[PDB]
Amino acid sequence: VNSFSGYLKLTDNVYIKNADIVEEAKKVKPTVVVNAANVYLKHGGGVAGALNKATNNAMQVESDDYIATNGPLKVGGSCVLSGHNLAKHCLHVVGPNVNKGEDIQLLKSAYENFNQHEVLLAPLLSAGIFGADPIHSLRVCVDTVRTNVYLAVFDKNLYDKLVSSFL
Ligand SMILES: O[C@H]1CC[C@@H]2CCN(c3ncnc4[nH]ccc34)[C@@H]21
Numbered sequence: 001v002n003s004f005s006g007y008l009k010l011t012d013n014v015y016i017k018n019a020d021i022v023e024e025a026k027k028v029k030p031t032v033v034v035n036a037a038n039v040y041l042k043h044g045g046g047v048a049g050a051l052n053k054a055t056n057n058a059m060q061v062e063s064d065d066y067i068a069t070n071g072p073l074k075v076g077g078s079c080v081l082s083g084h085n086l087a088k089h090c091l092h093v094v095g096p097n098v099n100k101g102e103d104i105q106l107l108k109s110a111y112e113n114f115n116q117h118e119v120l121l122a123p124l125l126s127a128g129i130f131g132a133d134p135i136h137s138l139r140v141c142v143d144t145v146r147t148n149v150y151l152a153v154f155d156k157n158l159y160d161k162l163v164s165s166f167l
Contacts (some may be wrong), residue, residue, distance in 0.1 A: 002119060003028050003073035004150045006094075010166055014142050016140075016147050021047060021152040022054045023125055027084040033083055034114070034122035037092035039072040041079075046129045047154075055084040063092070075102055088129030091117060098131030103112065105138065111144040117146045128154075136160055 007015035017024075024032045038045040041063035052059040062081055073079060078093040095110040096102035110125050124141065126132035134153075139151065142144035153159040 002148075004030075004121075010138075013146060016138075016150065016151040016153060016159070016162065018154075018156045019086065020050075020153040020154055021087070021121065022050050023151060024121060024152050025051075025083075026054070026148075028121065029087060029143055030083075030119065030121040031088045031089050032117045032120045033087035033089075034120055034125075035090050035092045036090055036128070037073065037078075037094050037125050039075060039077075039094050041092060047123045051086065051090070053141070054086060056093075058080060058082075058084050059090065061143055076106040078110075078113035087121070091120065093125060095125035095130055095137075096128065096132070099129070104132060107140050108144050109130065111141055114141075114145045114149055115147050117147055119150075121150045121152065123152060123154075133163055134158055134162060138166065 007017045009015055035051055043060050073094050075094050075096055081090050083090045093110050093113050096106045098105055107126050114120055124134050124137040127134040127137050139145055
C-alpha cells in the first residue's frame with residue numbers, strides 16, 4: 001500500500017491520472033520522481049522546467065555540477081540525483097526528442113531505466129515538447145516497465161484520450 005490517490009489502473013503495475021506532476025510530487029513526496037530530461041540536464045521547459053522551478057533552481061545547480069563532472073547523458077540513459085523538496089530522488093531520464101531527429105526506438109531503452117526502482121511517479125517520456133505520440137509512449141511504458149509506475153498526464157484532454165484509446 002502506498003499514498004498515491006485517484007489513479008486509474010491500466011495493468012498489474014501501471015497507473016495513470018490527469019495531474020500536474022509538480023503538485024503530485026509535493027503532495028506524495030515519492031521515493032522517486034522521474035524528470036523528462038535532456039542529455040545536458042538543461043531544465044528549461046516542459047516537465048523539466050516545471051520541476052526545476054519548483055526546486056527554486058536547486059535542481060539546475062546540482063545538474064550543472066553533475067554535467068561538469070560526468071559529461072552529458074546518453075539518449076535513452078538516466079542518472080539519479082536529489083529530489084530536493086519534491087521527492088527523495090529524481091531519476092532524470094532522456095527519451096528521444098523527435099523535434100531533434102532522435103530515434104524513437106530509443107524510447108524503450110529510456111523506459112528500461114524505470115525498472116531499477118520499485119515505485120516511481122513519472123511523466124510520459126518523449127511526449128509533450130519532445131514531439132512523440134503520447135499514445136505510443138504509453139504503450140511502450142506498459143510493455144517495458146515492470147515496476148510500479150504512477151503516470152501523471154498534465155493535459156486533461158490528452159488524459160481522456162489516452163484512457164479511451166488504451167488497449
Ligand atoms: O506527462 C507528460 C508527457 C508530455 C506532456 C507535456 C507536459 N507533461 C507534464 N505532465 C505532468 N505534469 C506536468 N507538469 C508540467 C508539465 C507536465 C506531459
